[PDB]
Design a binder for this molecule. Structure first.
Ligand SMILES: *C(=O)CCCCCCC
Ligand SMILES: *C(=O)CCCCCCC
Ligand SMILES: [N+]
Ligand SMILES: [N+]
Lengths: 406, 406
């Protein structure tokens, strides 16, 4: 009955390029959303996005970054952070069959998939395509482009489940620890930000389009006038480690993954059923007898989704409603990367004793009446936290993390 | 730790639209490669592929297929076959938290990703893109598009690992049964066939280009004159079930998954290290008290690749090499769907007592000497079979299946 703990974390987000910058943003309720000329020039209605403010040029060995797409790059940088944060020397995690990596993305790389088709149809054909498009566009790019340069010898693959992707990745890593198959598994994911993929969401009306003049107000989970989520890009990675192994080397422990839920709606393709989320959270709560002090919701700032999840939460907790805040109101929706990025925001809140505000709620949706939705940064000692991730296809994931004594 | 057996299978392949057609092709050593006008027109050098010879029009409900890409369609049809072949009905596998789905693809849908970009860049913009591109293009399309219409309530996500994709899905399904989380998990995957994706492989010189005039001979694993693999499309799906649960319902049991290996090279991005394959195979043989009677190699018909695996196999078995066959010689490389399709070819061989032929070996590579490579359909009573699946990024998967024994 092996225990799984998080001993290191790394992040590249719209609101910060390391845990310190992210910490400050969360505490200040600072938005990472900006106006995107690229999205506007593509012909989209949504002209806002949660972009990574960082020129990654030269941050990765050329011989290595040549095979990578943005999703892989973001995850790579995140992993470097997590390795250092975990205090793992090369000899400690490299060429070690007991050390694996499970990380993916929601869309792989639409940009390079399109680059290849465009190049191929041009005057140069194959010569224009080049020999690096496959590793960049394949769905497992995120895991393949990291496992190889990091000398990973254990498990190596990507779990993909739309907006639940990185959450499932972390959960699966936990399972590897529980099966005694691995001592350490770097888990997380990444996602590129481009009109190529964005227009696809805009074309189904999933993106916000009425607040382009005021980018930082576009993402407004629970607000009565929300009109879709704000697409974002970025990456995240956490070090899931077996408890004894962690203690033995004196690793710093953020928390223990005491609960992992993964269910399926078997209902609608792009809308949640809520019934599945209820089972997902309940599964994650099995054997967890401490109260959930804070719930980092999936809340993407969409009309149907936001309240559907609030309803499931009600069903699960009843008059025991935990503090709730939707960090996407600040960060935007990083899709496949949201799972790990939000587990990190939750771990930071747990580590530093505070609840990040759910911003831009000028008028609370009436269906959210009677819930403890935190709208102002609040200091508080937290012990157990829950984070939800739901994606198209009715795929659900929930992670419950708890502080260890002393 | 509970046991997992396969109680049903389904397949849409270049050599068959079902297990009967697949069985007939394998024993006959029939090829599924054809000349592709599409590949030639796109400007590629490789003009051959293993296409699915099936008019899928009207095979899937209008409201269901509208969200699907070819990879999803192939997997869906495979699942329908698996369900019927398993003897399961809606009342038993639908709306059941104890039944899940783990299936994926290698590249999601480059075709619909390119369609979205092409359409968006047109004068109609968002209107031309339509509201169904995300579910077709997202990496988790294969699992999302199946779990929803089939009403799955248990796990629901895609494992993606290039050419090892569907093999990892199966092993992960096994882990769900071993963890006691699920009683049944439909596992496998699919992959579309299009110049959009194929041209990326040609651009890196991975595809055969010298036999465009003799299609059925282009794919020739282990032949000294091999020159890259032949890309293919299709799907596969097996019903992974807990032992007691299967016996209790008088289910037909093809075999038990007695071994599952998953490792990482941590070396080259597009080339195998061999060291990883060795560990992967030994991991899947740990505890197996029976010898490997047959081995369905990864063998894609590439210069370095083919020989690297053989070297790994000699390293594992020494002088006790099992009968070896590379079915890709007649089917082609279905990338993400290869793992499950080849797991199925193996189950059929184990079920019908025979070893399919490794065709097109006009001249055996010298580095292949000393091994037992079967080049003729041979009747034999197998008990324990092994299937290997390797992918870019140094991702290795190995599955060992055996006749049932309580
Ligand atoms: C989240 O579930 C919405 C769908 C994201 C899919 C990944 C991007 C193609
Ligand atoms: C097999 O490992 C070769 C790469 C397959 C990627 C499929 C998506 C482009
Ligand atoms: N979350
Ligand atoms: N195989």
């Amino acid at each position: 009955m092996k225990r799984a703990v998080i001993t290191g974390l790394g992040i590249v987000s719209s609101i910060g390029n390391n845990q310190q910058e992210v910490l400050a943003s969360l505490r200040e309720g600072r938005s990472g959303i900006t106006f995107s000329q690229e999205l506007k020039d593509s012909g989209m209605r949504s002209h806002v996005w949660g972009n990574v403010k960082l020129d990654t040029t030269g941050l990765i060995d050329r011989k290595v970054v040549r095979f990578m797409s943005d999703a892989s790059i973001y995850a790579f940088l995140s992993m470097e952070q997590a390795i250092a944060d975990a205090g793992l020397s090369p000899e400690a995690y490299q060429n070690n069959p007991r050390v694996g990596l499970i990380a993916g993305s929601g869309g792989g790389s639409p940009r390079f998939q399109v680059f290849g088709a465009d190049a191929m149809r041009g005057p140069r054909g194959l010569k224009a395509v080049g020999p690096y498009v496959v590793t960049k566009a394949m769905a497992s790019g995120v895991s393949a482009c990291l496992a190889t340069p990091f000398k990973i010898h254990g498990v190596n693959y990507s779990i993909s489940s739309a907006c639940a992707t990185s959450a499932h990745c972390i959960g699966n890593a936990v399972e590897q620890i529980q099966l005694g198959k691995q001592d350490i598994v770097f888990a997380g994911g990444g996602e590129e930000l481009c009109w190529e993929m964005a227009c696809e969401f805009d074309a189904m009306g999933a993106l916000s389009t009425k607040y382009n003049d005021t980018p930082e107000k576009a993402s407004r989970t629970y607000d009565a006038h929300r009109d879709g989520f704000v697409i974002a890009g970025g990456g995240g990675m956490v070090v899931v480690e077996e408890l004894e192994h962690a203690l033995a080397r004196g690793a710093h422990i953020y928390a223990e993954i005491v609960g992992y839920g993964a269910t399926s709606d078997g209902a609608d393709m792009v809308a949640p059923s809520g019934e599945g989320a209820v089972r997902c959270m309940k599964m994650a709560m099995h054997g967890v007898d401490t109260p959930i002090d804070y719930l980092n919701s999936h809340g993407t700032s969409t009309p149907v989704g936001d309240v559907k999840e609030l309803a499931a939460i009600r069903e699960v907790f009843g008059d025991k409603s935990p503090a709730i805040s939707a960090t996407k109101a600040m960060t935007g929706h990083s899709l496949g990367a949201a799972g790990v990025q939000e587990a990190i925001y939750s771990l930071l809140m747990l580590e530093h004793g505070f609840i990040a505000p759910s911003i831009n709620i000028e008028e609370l949706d009436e269906q959210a009446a009677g819930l403890n939705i935190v709208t102002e940064t609040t200091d508080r000692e937290l012990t157990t936290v829950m984070s939800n991730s739901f994606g198209f296809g009715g795929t659900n994931a929930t992670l419950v993390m708890r502080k260890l004594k002393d």
